[PDB]
Amino acid sequence: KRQVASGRAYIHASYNNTIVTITDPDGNPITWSSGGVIGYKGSRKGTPYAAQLAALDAAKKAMAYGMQSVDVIVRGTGAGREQAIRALQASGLQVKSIVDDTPVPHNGCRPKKK
Amino acid sequence: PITKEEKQKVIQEFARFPGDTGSTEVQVALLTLRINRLSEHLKVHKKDHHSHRGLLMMVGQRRRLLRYLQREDPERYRALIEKLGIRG
Amino acid sequence: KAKVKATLGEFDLRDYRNVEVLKRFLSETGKILPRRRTGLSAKEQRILAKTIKRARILGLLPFTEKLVRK
Amino acid sequence: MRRYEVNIVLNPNLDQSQLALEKEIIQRALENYGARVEKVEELGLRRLAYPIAKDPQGYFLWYQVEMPEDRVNDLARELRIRDNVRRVMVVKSQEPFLANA
Amino acid sequence: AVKKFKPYTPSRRFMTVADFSEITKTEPEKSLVKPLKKTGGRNNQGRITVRFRGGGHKRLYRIIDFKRWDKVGIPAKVAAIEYDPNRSARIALLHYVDGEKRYIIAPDGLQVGQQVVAGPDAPIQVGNALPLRFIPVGTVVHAVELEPKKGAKLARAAGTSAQIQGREGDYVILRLPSGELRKVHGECYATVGAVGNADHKNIVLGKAGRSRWLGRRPHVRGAAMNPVDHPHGGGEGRAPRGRPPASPWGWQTKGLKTRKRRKPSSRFIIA
RNA sequence: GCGGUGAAAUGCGCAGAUACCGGGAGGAACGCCGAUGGCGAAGGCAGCCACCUGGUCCACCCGUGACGCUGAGGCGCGAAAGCGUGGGGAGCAAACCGGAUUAGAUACCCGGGUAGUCCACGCCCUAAACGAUGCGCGCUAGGUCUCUGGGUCUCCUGGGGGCCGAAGCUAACGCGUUAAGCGCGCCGCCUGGGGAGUACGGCCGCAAGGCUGAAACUCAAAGGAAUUGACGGGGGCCCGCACAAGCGGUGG
RNA sequence: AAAAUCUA
Ligand SMILES: [Mg+2]
Ligand SMILES: [Mg+2]
Ligand SMILES: [Mg+2]
Ligand SMILES: [Mg+2]
Ligand SMILES: [Mg+2]
Ligand SMILES: [Mg+2]
Ligand SMILES: [Mg+2]
Ligand SMILES: [Mg+2]
Ligand SMILES: [Mg+2]
Ligand SMILES: [Mg+2]
Ligand SMILES: [Mg+2]
Ligand SMILES: [Mg+2]
Ligand SMILES: [Mg+2]
Ligand SMILES: [Mg+2]
Ligand SMILES: [Mg+2]
Ligand SMILES: [Mg+2]
Ligand SMILES: [Mg+2]
Ligand SMILES: [Mg+2]
Ligand SMILES: [Mg+2]
Ligand SMILES: [Mg+2]
Ligand SMILES: [Mg+2]
Ligand SMILES: [Mg+2]
Ligand SMILES: [Mg+2]
Ligand SMILES: [Mg+2]
Ligand SMILES: [Mg+2]
Ligand SMILES: [Mg+2]
Ligand SMILES: [Mg+2]
Ligand SMILES: [Mg+2]
Ligand SMILES: [Mg+2]
Ligand SMILES: [Mg+2]
Ligand SMILES: [Mg+2]
Ligand SMILES: [Mg+2]
Ligand SMILES: [Mg+2]
Ligand SMILES: [Mg+2]
Ligand SMILES: [Mg+2]
Ligand SMILES: [Mg+2]
Ligand SMILES: [Mg+2]
Ligand SMILES: [Mg+2]
Ligand SMILES: [Mg+2]
Ligand SMILES: [Mg+2]
Ligand SMILES: [Mg+2]
Ligand SMILES: [Mg+2]
Ligand SMILES: [Mg+2]
Ligand SMILES: [Mg+2]
Ligand SMILES: [Mg+2]
Ligand SMILES: [Mg+2]
Ligand SMILES: [Mg+2]
Ligand SMILES: [Mg+2]
Ligand SMILES: [Mg+2]
Ligand SMILES: [Mg+2]
Ligand SMILES: [Mg+2]
Ligand SMILES: [Mg+2]
Ligand SMILES: [Mg+2]
Ligand SMILES: [Mg+2]
Ligand SMILES: [Mg+2]
Ligand SMILES: [Mg+2]
Ligand SMILES: [Mg+2]
Ligand SMILES: [Mg+2]
Ligand SMILES: [Mg+2]
Ligand SMILES: [Mg+2]
Ligand SMILES: [Mg+2]
Ligand SMILES: [Mg+2]
Ligand SMILES: [Mg+2]
Ligand SMILES: [Mg+2]
Ligand SMILES: [Mg+2]
Ligand SMILES: [Mg+2]
Ligand SMILES: [Mg+2]
Ligand SMILES: [Mg+2]
Ligand SMILES: [Mg+2]
Ligand SMILES: [Mg+2]
Ligand SMILES: [Mg+2]
Ligand SMILES: [Mg+2]
Ligand SMILES: [Mg+2]
Ligand SMILES: [Mg+2]
Ligand SMILES: [Mg+2]
Ligand SMILES: [Mg+2]
Ligand SMILES: [Mg+2]
Ligand SMILES: [Mg+2]
Ligand SMILES: [Mg+2]
Ligand SMILES: [Mg+2]
Ligand SMILES: [Mg+2]
Ligand SMILES: [Mg+2]
Incomplete structure (x- = not known):
């Protein structure tokens, strides 16, 4: 909500789209971004370049709140998984640390058609 | 399972002489105990069926033993069936 | 790289509380490491993992820990 | 009669009085269902891996009794009744197998 | 389960009746x-x-102890399991060692000659009864009170039960036989277990008279009457509804919440 | 804005969705170990704990003394789907509705979604119920991998799981101490294709439907493995003004 | 996502 130096950054990277969001050290988001906030539509939203622009825009929004350092956390295996990180490198924000945390079942929920 | 002591209490009773751990009647009674216990086991585990197969095979084995015993000598058979209370 | 068995001497693999021995088997993910990396026998590996799950239930061992930087 | 190891985790954040209080109840149930105790050991407080009852810590006990094989189920159930009692796990004891001889 | 009947007569090939085995x-x-x-x-x-309502068959009302708490700590012996023509559930004669004999709604799986008690000290186990704030969360229960010290009124029918979902302040949460979730005061007494005669529902009345024996009179369709006596009273050649289906007095039957809105007790319910 | 796809649309979201955190509800299923792995007569069987229980194998060289094998009918088991009575219901998902694709699309793809999938008891009893190989015993080269048991253990000796292969067999393919080899015992079953697992009778079942089970008739073939070639919106290497890059043309 | 057919 308010203004903080340290914080976190989540990456929801699906196949049809990759979106990201910055948050306070607690868990409550400050601002966010996606392929859609870049104006792209369709498979253009899942594009790695779009993930780059989305992460850069998200960083640009985070810097407005005075964010400087951020612990990053990733999820999913979308075609923009690494580009979030890559954009967050020279984003102007301290990368501090990177963590994978892709949710995965121990076989329980039956999958869709595929 | 069954106790070793409980096993000996039977073996000693059915033996024709001490150390007869394998005689016909010995095996018949010995199997009959397991037939009874397993039968009672099925009386609460109706779902269980493999155990029930084992029961069928045990009963069959016992019946073969009774075949040979009855064929060899009907008198010792006459005593054994009476002491184990079968056929009816 | 390194076989896990050579790290420690003789020990109880059935013991489900010697966490300092059992921890060296799950890597930075909590994954029950494959037999080809721990270098154990079948009989050994099986009851090892079986006691491992027990240790997981007690809150001693972790089910799945988040991987670090990648 | 069968050799059994019993593991019981309890609330890490409570006074020693409540600790001994619950321990007493454990003793009670044990004697009540014919659990003749042996080498008992109090492992004390330890840091857990995953948070149990939204708590990263946990107190530990470790009995080792012998009793008729049946009620060892029901006994466990008795241990379940008390709210403060977190984990319960009875395990049939076995010979400590040897690794890396 | 249920006793059946060979069709030596029609209206009897279906008529079933519960096996009164549990009755002592x-x-x-x-x-x-x-x-x-x-x-x-x-x-x-x-x-x-x-x-x-009418006809029926003579009935002596069995007086039941629905407020079982006036004898705190006092145990009793399950003397008997009796029939009761006034409730779906079976009943239970308990002999208090105090000397006073009384009745209680018979819970499921209740052995005759059982130990049973009523108090906050009670062992959490079938038959006993105690305040809700003492029963471990996530337990079957029946014959629950509502407001404290006012007698049991929740779940008293055969097979009925309620589960405790959690605690909150001086209140506790129950999942009623209607599936409704609700706050009920912690001080309210309730008996642990579930109501017996679970096999009640499976009965078939079989014929007409069987209804009459229960006192249930013949029920005439609204659409069979005349416009004076009933809304649906079109009656002209098995005519359809005159729109839309509604009671003899006017109010629409299918879908119409009748529960008063600003009822205070609404502040304690959920779904 | 999300979601979704080959690209989209239907859908959801300023009535504040997506993404993130905390609190809680409920159901189904068991990640890593995990495997060419183990168990069972078959179907099948996977989190961990305890109780109950079957079958199975090693050692000792202890006991019984041919007590064995097969087994028509009978009897019990028998995936999934489906049926009954009463529960349960998160995910999935026939049917159905919508979107797209298309000449059409009652489909493949997408958004919704009910029986069902789950437990209790009871019925149904079919399958590519597959090793397409009935059971039991015995004789007939070795090499290697693996599960397990015993013994002072780079070896020796039992019991299972895979590959290569002596002889030999086979129509070829391929089998081959886990026979399709050489023998015996016994049960089941076949006699061209279609008609047809249909019809009638009988038995069973709540129904669906299952077990037995033909003929008239028609065809001069049906079928098995292998060879050769063409062929594929099969694969790999490779080529040509074939595409590409580029210059002028016709079609007007 | 596209390539539906080919009288004796
Ligand atoms: Mg997309
Ligand atoms: Mg895409
Ligand atoms: Mg993409
Ligand atoms: Mg998420
Ligand atoms: Mg998700
Ligand atoms: Mg989906
Ligand atoms: Mg015979
Ligand atoms: Mg008779
Ligand atoms: Mg031993
Ligand atoms: Mg009057
Ligand atoms: Mg009056
Ligand atoms: Mg008057
Ligand atoms: Mg009257
Ligand atoms: Mg009177
Ligand atoms: Mg009087
Ligand atoms: Mg009396
Ligand atoms: Mg509970
Ligand atoms: Mg009435
Ligand atoms: Mg009525
Ligand atoms: Mg009137
Ligand atoms: Mg009138
Ligand atoms: Mg009308
Ligand atoms: Mg009329
Ligand atoms: Mg009107
Ligand atoms: Mg309503
Ligand atoms: Mg009204
Ligand atoms: Mg009113
Ligand atoms: Mg529309
Ligand atoms: Mg939101
Ligand atoms: Mg949450
Ligand atoms: Mg936290
Ligand atoms: Mg549950
Ligand atoms: Mg077989
Ligand atoms: Mg066999
Ligand atoms: Mg066994
Ligand atoms: Mg046979
Ligand atoms: Mg089914
Ligand atoms: Mg139907
Ligand atoms: Mg459609
Ligand atoms: Mg077309
Ligand atoms: Mg159309
Ligand atoms: Mg057109
Ligand atoms: Mg059309
Ligand atoms: Mg239609
Ligand atoms: Mg059959
Ligand atoms: Mg066949
Ligand atoms: Mg064939
Ligand atoms: Mg060999
Ligand atoms: Mg060895
Ligand atoms: Mg030896
Ligand atoms: Mg050898
Ligand atoms: Mg030898
Ligand atoms: Mg030897
Ligand atoms: Mg060996
Ligand atoms: Mg082979
Ligand atoms: Mg082969
Ligand atoms: Mg071969
Ligand atoms: Mg040769
Ligand atoms: Mg020859
Ligand atoms: Mg070989
Ligand atoms: Mg023919
Ligand atoms: Mg034809
Ligand atoms: Mg024919
Ligand atoms: Mg048929
Ligand atoms: Mg017919
Ligand atoms: Mg005839
Ligand atoms: Mg006949
Ligand atoms: Mg059909
Ligand atoms: Mg059919
Ligand atoms: Mg014929
Ligand atoms: Mg004929
Ligand atoms: Mg061919
Ligand atoms: Mg060109
Ligand atoms: Mg030019
Ligand atoms: Mg020119
Ligand atoms: Mg031109
Ligand atoms: Mg021209
Ligand atoms: Mg021209
Ligand atoms: Mg045509
Ligand atoms: Mg044609
Ligand atoms: Mg042609
Ligand atoms: Mg034509």
Whole structure:
């Protein structure tokens, strides 16, 4: 909500789209971004370049709140998984640390058609 | 399972002489105990069926033993069936 | 790289509380490491993992820990 | 009669009085269902891996009794009744197998 | 389960009746201070207020201890399991060692000659009874109170039960037989377990008269009547509804919440 | 804005969705170990704990003394789907509705979604119920991998799981101490294709439907493995003004 | 996502 130096950054990277969001050290988001906030539509939203622009825009929004350092956390295996990180490198924000945390079942929920 | 002591209490009773751990009647009674216990086991585990197969095979084995015993000598058979209370 | 068995001497693999021995088997993910990396026998590996799950239930061992930087 | 190891985790954040209080109840149930105790050991407080009852810590006990094989189920159930009692796990004891001889 | 009948007559090939195996042998009810007279077919003004009640068969009302807490700590022996023509559930004669005999709604799986008690000290185990704030969360329960010290009124029918979902302040949460979740005061007593005669539902009345024996009178369709006597009273050649289906007095039957809105007790319910 | 796809649309979201955190409800299923792995007569069987229980194998060289094998009918088991009575219901998902694709699309793809999938008891009893190989015993080269048991253990000796292969067999393919080899015992079953697992009778079942089970008739073939070639919106290497890059043309 | 057919 308010203004903080340290914080976190989540990456929801699906196949049809990759979106990201910055948050306070607690868990409550400050601002966010996606392929859609870049104006792209369709498979253009899942594009790695779009993930780059989305992460850069998200960083640009985070810097407005005075964010400087951020612990990053990733999820999913979308075609923009690494580009979030890559954009967050020279984003102007301290990368501090990177963590994978892709949710995965121990076989329980039956999958869709595929 | 069954106790070793409980096993000996039977073996000693059915033996024709001490150390007869394998005689016909010995095996018949010995199997009959397991037939009874397993039968009672099925009386609460109706779902269980493999155990029930084992029961069928045990009963069959016992019946073969009774075949040979009855064929060899009907008198010792006459005593054994009476002491184990079968056929009816 | 390194076989896990050579790290420690003789020990109880059935013991489900010697966490300092059992921890060296799950890597930075909590994954029950494959037999080809721990270098154990079948009989050994099986009851090892079986006691491992027990240790997981007690809150001693972790089910799945988040991987670090990648 | 069968050799059994019993593991019981309890609330890490409570006074020693409540600790001994619950321990007493454990003793009670044990004697009540014919659990003749042996080498008992109090492992004390330890840091857990995953948070149990939204708590990263946990107190530990470790009995080792012998009793008729049946009620060892029901006994466990008795241990379940008390709210403060977190984990319960009875395990049939076995010979400590040897690794890396 | 249920007893059946060979079709040596129609209206009997379907008629089933519960096996009274759980009853301990007793035709005479505890003729002490438990039986009592009973009557009524319509309100105090001779008018009818409930349609289709009457006929029936004579019944001595068994007086039940629904407020079982006045004897705290005092144990009792499950003397008997009796029939009761006034409830779906079976009943249970318990002999308090105090000397006083009384009745309780018979819970499921209740052995005759069982130990049973009522108090906050009680062992959490079938038959016993105690305040809700003492029963471990996530337990079956029946014959629950509502407001404290006002007698049990929740779950008293055969097979019925409620589960405790959690605690909150001086209140506790129950999942009613209607599936409804609700706050009920912690001080309210309740008996642990579930109500017996679970096999009640499977009965088939079989024929007409069987209804009459229960007192249920013949029920005439609204659409069979005349426009004066009933809304649906079109009657002209098995005519369809005159739109839309509604009671003899006017209110629409299918889908119409009748629960008063600003009822205070609404502040304690959930779904 | 999300979601979704080959690209989209239907859908959801300023009535504040997506993404993130905390609190809680409920159901189904068991990640890593995990495997060419183990168990069972078959179907099948996977989190961990305890109780109950079957079958199975090693050692000792202890006991019984041919007590064995097969087994028509009978009897019990028998995936999934489906049926009954009463529960349960998160995910999935026939049917159905919508979107797209298309000449059409009652489909493949997408958004919704009910029986069902789950437990209790009871019925149904079919399958590519597959090793397409009935059971039991015995004789007939070795090499290697693996599960397990015993013994002072780079070896020796039992019991299972895979590959290569002596002889030999086979129509070829391929089998081959886990026979399709050489023998015996016994049960089941086949006699061209279609008609047809249909019809009638009988038995069973709540129904669906299952077990037995033909003929008239028609065809001069049906079928098995292998060879050769063409062929594929099969694969790999490779080529040509074939595409590409580029210059002018016709079609007007 | 596209390539439906080919009288004896
Ligand atoms: Mg997309
Ligand atoms: Mg895409
Ligand atoms: Mg993409
Ligand atoms: Mg998420
Ligand atoms: Mg998700
Ligand atoms: Mg999906
Ligand atoms: Mg014979
Ligand atoms: Mg008779
Ligand atoms: Mg031992
Ligand atoms: Mg009087
Ligand atoms: Mg009187
Ligand atoms: Mg009056
Ligand atoms: Mg009056
Ligand atoms: Mg009057
Ligand atoms: Mg009357
Ligand atoms: Mg008495
Ligand atoms: Mg519970
Ligand atoms: Mg009435
Ligand atoms: Mg009525
Ligand atoms: Mg009137
Ligand atoms: Mg009138
Ligand atoms: Mg009308
Ligand atoms: Mg009329
Ligand atoms: Mg009107
Ligand atoms: Mg309503
Ligand atoms: Mg009204
Ligand atoms: Mg009103
Ligand atoms: Mg529309
Ligand atoms: Mg939101
Ligand atoms: Mg949450
Ligand atoms: Mg936290
Ligand atoms: Mg549950
Ligand atoms: Mg077989
Ligand atoms: Mg066999
Ligand atoms: Mg066994
Ligand atoms: Mg046979
Ligand atoms: Mg089914
Ligand atoms: Mg149907
Ligand atoms: Mg459609
Ligand atoms: Mg077309
Ligand atoms: Mg169309
Ligand atoms: Mg057109
Ligand atoms: Mg059309
Ligand atoms: Mg239609
Ligand atoms: Mg059959
Ligand atoms: Mg066949
Ligand atoms: Mg064939
Ligand atoms: Mg060899
Ligand atoms: Mg060895
Ligand atoms: Mg030896
Ligand atoms: Mg050898
Ligand atoms: Mg030898
Ligand atoms: Mg030897
Ligand atoms: Mg060996
Ligand atoms: Mg082979
Ligand atoms: Mg082969
Ligand atoms: Mg071969
Ligand atoms: Mg040769
Ligand atoms: Mg030859
Ligand atoms: Mg070989
Ligand atoms: Mg023919
Ligand atoms: Mg034809
Ligand atoms: Mg034919
Ligand atoms: Mg048929
Ligand atoms: Mg027919
Ligand atoms: Mg005829
Ligand atoms: Mg006949
Ligand atoms: Mg059909
Ligand atoms: Mg059919
Ligand atoms: Mg014929
Ligand atoms: Mg004929
Ligand atoms: Mg061919
Ligand atoms: Mg060109
Ligand atoms: Mg030019
Ligand atoms: Mg020119
Ligand atoms: Mg031109
Ligand atoms: Mg020209
Ligand atoms: Mg021209
Ligand atoms: Mg055509
Ligand atoms: Mg044609
Ligand atoms: Mg042609
Ligand atoms: Mg034509």
